[PDB]
Structure 1
Amino acid sequence: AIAQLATEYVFSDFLLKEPTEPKFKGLRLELAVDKMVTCIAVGLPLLLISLAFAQEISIGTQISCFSPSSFSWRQAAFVDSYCWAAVQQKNSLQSESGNLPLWLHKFFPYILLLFAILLYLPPLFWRFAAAPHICSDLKFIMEELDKVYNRAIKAAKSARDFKYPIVEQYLKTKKNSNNLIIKYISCRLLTLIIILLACIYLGYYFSLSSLSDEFVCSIKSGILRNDSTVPDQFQCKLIAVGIFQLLSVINLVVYVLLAPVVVYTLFVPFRQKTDVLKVYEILPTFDVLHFKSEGYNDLSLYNLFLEENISEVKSYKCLKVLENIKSSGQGIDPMLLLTNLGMI
């Protein structure tokens, strides 16, 4: 039913499931905005397909041709289904709007499903190509940060009672390589292109006269060509075309609202702000150098991924609260770090 479809597609974890594998434990592997965009762009057309043929909104068959009274119910079914299959056969029907409107009315669910699949494709390519590498690198970064925080707190405790910047060097090296950012940008751009094409198609579908669903149908090919009792033509109407138009304009509105989000996601360096690593700069064991900004490189993407999935790190949380308390300046950063005792 309508409610079941809603629960499946909006109120449930449709495409929101975390990776079902121990490799990615607690790692999103996908930005929240991108996940929202993909979920909307994929599960909206599916939801509209399901709604358009719901047991309640749907009167019944998808086409009726109004055969003469003399025709039996089976002859009427023959006429209806013949015209349904003959929307593609151009000679069979003669409609003012043409034959493309009939093609579109018959295959609208297929086109919506195609758009959903094409929008889900780039996310899947990301997941199966660039997600494992970024996940491994981010796990390494998290482990390095936790280890350096533990070493710093241990040193502070020893004072009260190697030292090489491996992670910073790794980030600096990542500053040059840009394959990951290139893949991300290409996926976002393809998603935007697919969304714009879908908007064009939906606008064309919704701009129709709304009478193109009605077409003239002629069962007059073969032995029935010269038959007399059969009328020369029939009046057929494609049902649910208005519902398709309504759902198409709804999807068009959603996609036009979503496209600005897509271009914003494409403009990654502007998103690269609120330095996550600035918090760690107070640790004696961590070098005071962020050096991550203003670059169309994988470093900005890694910074965004950290800002997205760093709240799960206890050391980062402790450093963040220490910096927050430093806003007043009443205490001292090393004293607060020693007092916290948050190694694990």
Structure 2
Amino acid sequence: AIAQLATEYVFSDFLLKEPTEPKFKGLRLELAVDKMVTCIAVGLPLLLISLAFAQEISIGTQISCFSPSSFSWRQAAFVDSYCWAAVQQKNSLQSESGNLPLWLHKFFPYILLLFAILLYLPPLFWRFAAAPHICSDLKFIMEELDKVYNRAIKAAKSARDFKYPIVEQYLKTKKNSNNLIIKYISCRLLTLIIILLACIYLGYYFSLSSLSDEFVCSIKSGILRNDSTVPDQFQCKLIAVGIFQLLSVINLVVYVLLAPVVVYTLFVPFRQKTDVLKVYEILPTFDVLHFKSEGYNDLSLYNLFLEENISEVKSYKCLKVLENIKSSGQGIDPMLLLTNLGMI
């Protein structure tokens, strides 16, 4: 049913499942824009395939050949099945557009599934090769931030009654290596390349004459060759090709809307904005240094992932509360922090 496919592929959490494992607990490991680009680019061809054969849009078989009236039921079934299998054998069928449109019309679901798989591959490579590396580091950074917050408020609480910037040094180190960022821009670049190839294929397929689904087929190989009761050629038509083209144009539109999103995603430093650690600079136990910007290096990628997963950090939430209050400038940062009383 149409509504079942709708639920399964947009309303269900299709490709939105969090990693079912206690190693990454609440950690996203895939940027929201990347998760939605993957969800679209993968589920749309699948949702389109499932629609192209919805039981109410499909009239029946995928091909019909119009055997003569003298032909029995089973002879007509033979003609249909033979021509269906004969869209490959170029000698049997004669089509005005060519044999390539026939191949594309028969194997359109396979090609869409191929595009879905190829578009799922880069997110899979990211989830397996580079997601744990960033997950461990991000979990460590969040733990260290919570610890420095607790120590800062404990020092402030003792005042109301070591000191090494380890996380800052770790991020300074991340500023050097660029392995994770080249992995990220490589998976994004393969996603963009496959999306553009899919756009090219879908634009070509939609550009077909729309009469290329009608091909002349001749069951005259083998012992049927010099047979006389069988006519020389049959007029076959590939049903559901109009549906294929109407769905291919939808896929092409969505993909050419998605490609600018991927291209923008490709520029990872430009997206690093709203410096997340700047809110921590108001802590005594934390050095006054953001030092996170301007590079095609893993530091910018970590900045993005921190900007995403930082809302889970309670200390960040309270510090951002104080920072927003500081916009008015009524009281003072350490006083409001001591008032806070939120170690964990």
Q: TM-score, normalised by structure 1?
A: 1.00
| Shift of residue 267, structure 1, vs aligned partner | 0.4
| Shift of residue 131, structure 1, vs aligned partner | 0.5
Partner of 2:17: 17
| Shift of residue 227, structure 1, vs aligned partner | 0.4
Distance 1:21 1:63 in 2: 47
| Shift of residue 163, structure 1, vs aligned partner | 0.4
Partner of 1:306: 306
Distance 2:142 2:272 in 1: 19
Question: What is the root-mean-square deviation of aligned Cα atoms in Å?
Answer: 0.4
1:85-113 deviations in Å (ceiling 9; x for gaps) = 00010000000000000000000000000
| Shift of residue 288, structure 1, vs aligned partner | 0.4
Distance 1:222 1:263 in 2: 55
| Shift of residue 74, structure 1, vs aligned partner | 0.6
Distance 1:175 1:16 in 2: 30
| Shift of residue 328, structure 1, vs aligned partner | 0.2
| Shift of residue 331, structure 1, vs aligned partner | 0.6
Distance 2:278 2:265 in 1: 23
Distance 1:35 1:226 in 2: 60
Distance 1:11 1:120 in 2: 19
| Shift of residue 252, structure 1, vs aligned partner | 0.2
1:255-314 deviations in Å (ceiling 9; x for gaps) = 000000001100011001110000000000000001111100000000000100110111
1:133-191 deviations in Å (ceiling 9; x for gaps) = 10000010001000000000000000010100000000000001000000000000000
SS at match of 1:215: strand
Distance 1:330 1:239 in 2: 72
Distance 1:89 1:275 in 2: 62
SS at match of 2:77: helix
Distance 1:259 1:98 in 2: 31
User: What are the ranges of 5 or more consecutive residues in structure 1 without an aligned counterpart?
Assistant: none
SS at match of 1:223: helix
Give identity over the alignment, percent. Answer: 100
Distance 1:132 1:192 in 2: 23
Distance 2:191 2:73 in 1: 48
1:7-26 deviations in Å (ceiling 9; x for gaps) = 00000100000000000100
Distance 1:287 1:255 in 2: 45
Distance 1:280 1:340 in 2: 15
Distance 1:321 1:263 in 2: 34
| Shift of residue 338, structure 1, vs aligned partner | 0.3
1:29-74 deviations in Å (ceiling 9; x for gaps) = 1000000000000000000000000100000000000000010111
Distance 1:293 1:25 in 2: 27
1:199-231 deviations in Å (ceiling 9; x for gaps) = 000000000110000000000000000000100
| Shift of residue 245, structure 1, vs aligned partner | 0.2
Distance 1:74 1:337 in 2: 85
Partner of 1:171: 171
Distance 1:314 1:89 in 2: 66
| Shift of residue 116, structure 1, vs aligned partner | 0.3
Distance 2:336 2:75 in 1: 87
Partner of 2:251: 251
Distance 1:322 1:94 in 2: 76
| Shift of residue 236, structure 1, vs aligned partner | 0.1
Distance 1:293 1:21 in 2: 32
1:232-268 deviations in Å (ceiling 9; x for gaps) = 0000000100000000000000000000000110001
| Shift of residue 128, structure 1, vs aligned partner | 0.5
Runs of at least 4 residues off by over 2 Å: none
SS at match of 2:284: coil
Distance 1:184 1:249 in 2: 30
Distance 1:188 1:249 in 2: 24
- 1:60 matched to 2:60? The reply is yes
SS at match of 2:237: strand
User: What are the ranges of 5 or more consecutive residues in structure 2 without an aligned counterpart?
Assistant: none
Distance 1:82 1:214 in 2: 15
